Amino acid sequence: STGSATTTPIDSLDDAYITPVQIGTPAQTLNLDFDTGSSDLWVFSSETTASEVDGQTIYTPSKSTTAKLLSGATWSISYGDGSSSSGDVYTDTVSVGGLTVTGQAVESAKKVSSSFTEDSTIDGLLGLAFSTLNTVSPTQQKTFFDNAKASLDSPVFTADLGYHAPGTYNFGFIDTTAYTGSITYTAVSTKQGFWEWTSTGYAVGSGTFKSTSIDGIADTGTTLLYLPATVVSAYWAQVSGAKSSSSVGGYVFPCSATLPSFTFGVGSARIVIPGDYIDFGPISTGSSSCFGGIQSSAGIGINIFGDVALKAAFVVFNGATTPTLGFASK
């Protein structure tokens, strides 16, 4: 089997991407944030504290003939930005782009933190990191991908995020028309439950490539590119007027600037992030100070190849017995 679904930016900045997901019988379609940095499939629901729902589409398990309460199971998750959600668990039929999993753990939110409430466009998350990070207790649950894997033509999914445009998540096959050149594969460590890999270095604009190992995670659920302070400083030094602002919480730059590209290494190959991808617009409405798309990972404790990086590539999440990551230009 295979699946193929379009993923769409939630706003003009590509702050996140939503992908339609069919849950239950009859189908209830929710727009979920596919997140290769976490491993819970959770949804706004009929059980969500009413004051914490503001425009999201909710899953109502009582209206699904295939929903079954997973007795005793609870979940609770905290994300790197300080947001959180928690609740109980159903199993139900979940389909993505024509690909169907029966008995998928659907984590029903009883509580969500303010940033989820305040984002009316995201109805939940669909985790695609390794199932070892799944927060369901006392019986940990498998991701959608993990459940689908055996049925897939090939045990892979691919992320093809658009810049200011829709893209595609495919399951079970590699669309050879979706990228240019060849796919370069690179080793993955699953020891932290992430799609963790080592970039071979970077360049800023037309500058020379610096060969240096950068361990990080391929994370579709993170907006920006978080890299070591040395790297990030070298990037923003090429932008006149750019500075790190503690009050804003990162590098800002004059909105009048033309940003240089940023290249990262995948083995001997190179992925080029165009400068425009690194502009996340005024820090506040009407401001001429713009927020940078490359930020320091210092104090996060991990480097994160988020959407800014991933949207410059066709990315293969290879879930073979020994997982690997593939990157191609596109």
Side-chain angles (χ1 to χ4, degrees), residues 1-62 64-67 69-109 112-141 143-148 150-190 192-242 244-330:
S1 67
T2 62
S4 180
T6 298
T7 192
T8 303
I10 63 165
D11 62 25
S12 65
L13 300 176
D14 298 346
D15 281 315
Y17 299 76
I18 47 171
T19 309
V21 176
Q22 283 68 50
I23 309 175
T25 308
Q28 303 179 38
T29 297
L30 272 66
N31 294 326
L32 307 186
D33 188 346
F34 283 24
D35 179 12
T36 60
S38 71
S39 307
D40 289 50
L41 193 177
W42 75 260
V43 296
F44 279 78
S45 77
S46 59
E47 300 180 326
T48 308
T49 297
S51 60
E52 297 181 349
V53 185
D54 183 10
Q56 296 80 10
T57 293
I58 62 171
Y59 170 60
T60 304
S62 70
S64 172
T65 57
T66 43
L69 178 71
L70 186 64
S71 181
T74 56
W75 63 280
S76 176
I77 189 162
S78 303
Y79 298 101
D81 69 342
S83 70
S84 64
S85 50
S86 60
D88 51 21
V89 187
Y90 293 82
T91 57
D92 208 340
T93 302
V94 173
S95 300
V96 175
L99 171 66
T100 299
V101 167
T102 54
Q104 174 66 43
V106 177
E107 298 171 38
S108 172
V112 306
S113 65
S114 58
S115 67
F116 288 116
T117 300
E118 291 162 4
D119 186 6
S120 65
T121 70
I122 292 177
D123 301 326
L125 269 61
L126 186 150
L128 293 165
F130 293 88
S131 291
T132 52
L133 296 178
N134 176 265
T135 77
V136 178
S137 178
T139 309
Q140 183 173 63
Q141 299 295 302
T143 67
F144 174 81
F145 177 54
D146 215 330
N147 282 322
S151 302
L152 298 176
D153 290 1
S154 181
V156 304
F157 67 90
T158 64
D160 179 12
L161 304 178
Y163 166 68
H164 292 354
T168 306
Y169 280 102
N170 290 328
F171 291 85
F173 73 104
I174 290 162
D175 181 355
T176 61
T177 72
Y179 59 87
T180 63
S182 58
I183 305 179
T184 298
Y185 289 86
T186 198
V188 163
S189 173
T190 63
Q192 291 193 93
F194 301 120
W195 293 91
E196 188 170 354
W197 64 290
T198 301
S199 170
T200 47
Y202 70 100
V204 178
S206 53
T208 58
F209 186 85
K210 175 75 174 186
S211 294
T212 186
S213 294
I214 308 297
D215 300 339
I217 65 167
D219 186 1
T220 57
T222 293
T223 312
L224 306 186
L225 172 53
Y226 295 88
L227 294 171
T230 50
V231 180
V232 176
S233 182
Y235 178 80
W236 288 109
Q238 298 303 311
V239 180
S240 184
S244 179
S245 169
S246 52
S247 56
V248 176
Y251 281 88
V252 296
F253 68 94
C255 291
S256 59
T258 301
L259 297 178
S261 63
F262 185 89
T263 300
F264 63 94
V266 182
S268 60
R270 307 288 180 253
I271 300 301
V272 180
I273 306 169
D276 282 2
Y277 289 29
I278 298 160
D279 186 344
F280 277 74
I283 59 167
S284 291
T285 306
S287 180
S288 72
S289 175
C290 273
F291 199 69
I294 296 176
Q295 297 293 348
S296 179
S297 64
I300 289 176
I302 196 164
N303 302 306
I304 304 172
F305 292 89
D307 300 334
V308 163
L310 300 184
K311 77 175 74 168
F314 180 87
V315 189
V316 180
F317 294 80
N318 170 25
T321 304
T322 297
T324 64
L325 274 171
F327 294 80
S329 298
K330 67 187 184 189

